[PDB]
Ligand binder design. Structure first.
Ligand SMILES: Nc1ncnc2c1ncn2[C@@H]1O[C@H](CSCC[C@H](N)C(=O)O)[C@@H](O)[C@H]1O
Length: 234
């Protein structure tokens, strides 16, 4: 109704950046205290690796391409350092927060020695456009809540342009347990329901080819879901 203010109306990019710029540039920092002294990094990587294994038959490169990925909302590069580098031929990263970018050069040093890091785009995803046709995989994890719904639809539409033939978008994010989105004043982001995600994916012209629950996380955390998305055919 005219009286309701949507959860995503409260998002302010500047407030998110102010929060994250003061977060420690460590696994503990980006995971909000659920670092290597907890099960979370290990479970997260296992779940993502299992998801990509399930998806292997859906991700064969076409038209002479190689497995160029991008790590969206990358933080200090944890997902690339501990997971994506095994799957990908080359990795770009998108991250707006400068202390995180600076630490990424340390975290990713061994990958840089191989030339496996292409470009680090120091930008919010809302202002980023992939090069057309570049990516085999666009991996978005624990970051799309920083964009309101309309902006997230727009971002996903730009992602489609950035996909190789048979490229894939993965979104690995929290879900609220009910059909009402939650705004977090801490990081100026929304947590969405599964139903909201499915609406957004449809509006963006994406088909859901897999939806899997991340297992093994502490019960006090929101559920986490992995979504694999392909553009709808013309
Ligand atoms: N508008 C935006 N666009 C892209 N990333 C954003 C963003 N606003 C915040 N972020 C980033 O989202 C990240 C959330 S923490 C998760 C980091 C990483 N995906 C991992 O799983 O380890 C932070 O690095 C934060 O700076």
């Amino acid at each position: 109704h005219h009286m309701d203010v949507p959860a995503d109306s409260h998002i302010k990019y500047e407030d998110a950046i102010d929060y994250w710029t003061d977060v420690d540039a460590t696994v503990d920092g980006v995971l909000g205290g659920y670092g290597e002294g907890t099960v979370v990094p290990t479970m997260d990587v296992l779940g993502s690796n299992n998801f990509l294994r399930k998806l292997k038959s859906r991700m064969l490169p076409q038209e002479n391409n190689v497995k160029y990925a991008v790590d969206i909302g990358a933080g200090i590069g944890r997902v690339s350092k501990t997971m994506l580098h095994k799957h990908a031929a080359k990795i770009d990263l998108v991250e707006p927060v400068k202390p995180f970018i600076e630490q990424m050069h340390v975290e990713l040093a061994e990958l840089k020695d191989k030339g496996q890091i292409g470009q680090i785009y120091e930008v919010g995803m809302q202002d980023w456009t992939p090069d057309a046709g570049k990516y085999w995989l666009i991996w978005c994890q624990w970051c799309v809540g920083h964009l309101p719904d309309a902006e997230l639809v727009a971002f996903l539409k730009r992602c489609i342009v950035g996909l190789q033939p048979n490229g894939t978008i993965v979104v690995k994010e929290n879900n609220t347990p009910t059909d009402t989105d939650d705004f977090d004043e801490t990081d100026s982001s929304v947590t969405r329901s599964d139903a909201k995600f499915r609406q957004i994916f449809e509006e963006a012209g994406l088909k859901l080819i897999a939806s899997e629950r991340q297992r093994g996380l502490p019960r006090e955390l929101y559920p986490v879901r992995m979504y694999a998305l392909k553009p709808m055919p013309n």
